[PDB]
Amino acid sequence: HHWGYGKHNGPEHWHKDFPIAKGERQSPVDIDTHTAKYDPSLKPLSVSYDQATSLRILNNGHAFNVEFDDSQDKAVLKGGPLDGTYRLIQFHFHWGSLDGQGSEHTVDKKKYAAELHLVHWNTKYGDFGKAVQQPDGLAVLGIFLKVGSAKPGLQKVVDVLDSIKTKGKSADFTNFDPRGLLPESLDYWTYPGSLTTPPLLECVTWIVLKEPISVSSEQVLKFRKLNFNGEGEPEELMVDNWRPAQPLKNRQIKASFK
């Protein structure tokens, strides 16, 4: 009886195995745009993905991860609220069964169709496993998806999903350029939070871009054909793999923009 996104194992049950689920800096949160304060001391984000080396795509039973070679400073995130250098390890998405839900963060209570998470770890801690034990161990760049025009840079991801339909399946996924998933603007909100799945560790500086990317209905429909289950098991579509907004508690969300 493992955690997931069903009625008997979903987000409202996670606290039983992971008591930090009710902690002081849990994610995601609702971003109240009128309460978020412009912080003129925040720097522009530095997203340096030109040397990114993608390796593999994996259905882990909760989402799919596009994994990168993080054994050198290839693809890194710096600046903004961050001190030091954060190395890209993987990206994944959360999405809904319908276009009106799917994102983890919300903006004035608005839910987007999906949310992209580019996960980075602070290189002062040496490895990802050590980084997640630190309050400034990870930086996750979150990007909202809305349904409209297709995102050309997403299609290579979409087209490999048939080969990783079920939990535990992976496929080679080299030479994928994550720069093709970014919006035009790097304006962002930032706050201290957590992993949004178990183990829910409070180790993340969240950087959530204001500008969503547009993906087509056909692209998101292919996300929704994935399976939570393993091969040869009863089919359960991988949809609604998002955690709802958690209490903000003693936190302030800062904006990089006026």
Ligand X SMILES: NS(O)(O)c1ccc(-n2cc(COc3ccccc3)nn2)cc1
244 binds, options ligand X, Zn ion, none, Cβ within 5 to 8 A by partner type: none
Phi, psi (degrees; rounded to nearest 5) at 108? 50, 45
Q: How many CB atoms lie within 10 A of CB 109?
A: 9
Whole-number minimum distance, CB 196 to Zn ion, in Å?
5
A 10 A CB-CB count for 211 gives: 13
Residues known to be catalytic = 62
Of these partners, ligand X, Zn ion, none, which one is at the site of residue 119 (CB under 5 to 8 Å by kind)? ligand X
Contact residues for ligand X, defined by CB under 6 A: 117, 119, 128-129, 132, 140, 195-197, 199
For the CB of residue 37, give the shortest distance to Zn ion in the complex, in Å.
25
Smaller CB distance to ligand X: residue 132 or 150? Answer: 132
Strand 76-79 and strand 204-209: the pairing is: unpaired
Positions at the binding site for Zn(2+):
92, 94, 117
Amino acid of residue 148: G
Which amino acid appears at position 36 of this protein?
Answer: A
CB of 81 or CB of 193, closer to Zn ion: 193
Binding mask 106-125 for Zn ion (x = CB under 5 A): -----------x--------
Cα angle: 150, vertex 107, 40; to 5 degrees: 105
Q: Which residues have a Cβ under 8 Å from the Cβ of 48 and sit 6 or more positions away? A: 75, 76, 77, 78
Torsion of CA 100, 105, 109, 114, to 10 degrees: -10
* C-beta closer to Zn ion: residue 117 or 120: 117
The least CB distance from residue 94 to Zn ion, in Å, is: 6
Q: Which residues are annotated as a binding site for substrate?
A: 196-197
Least distance in Å: CB of 17 to ligand X? 13
3-state SS, residue 179: helix
Nearer to Zn ion, 246 or 257 (CB): 246
Would you mind telling me the total number of residues written for the chain in this entry?
258
Binding residue positions:
92, 94, 117, 196-197
User: Where do contacts with Zn ion occur on this chain (CB under 5 A)?
Assistant: 117
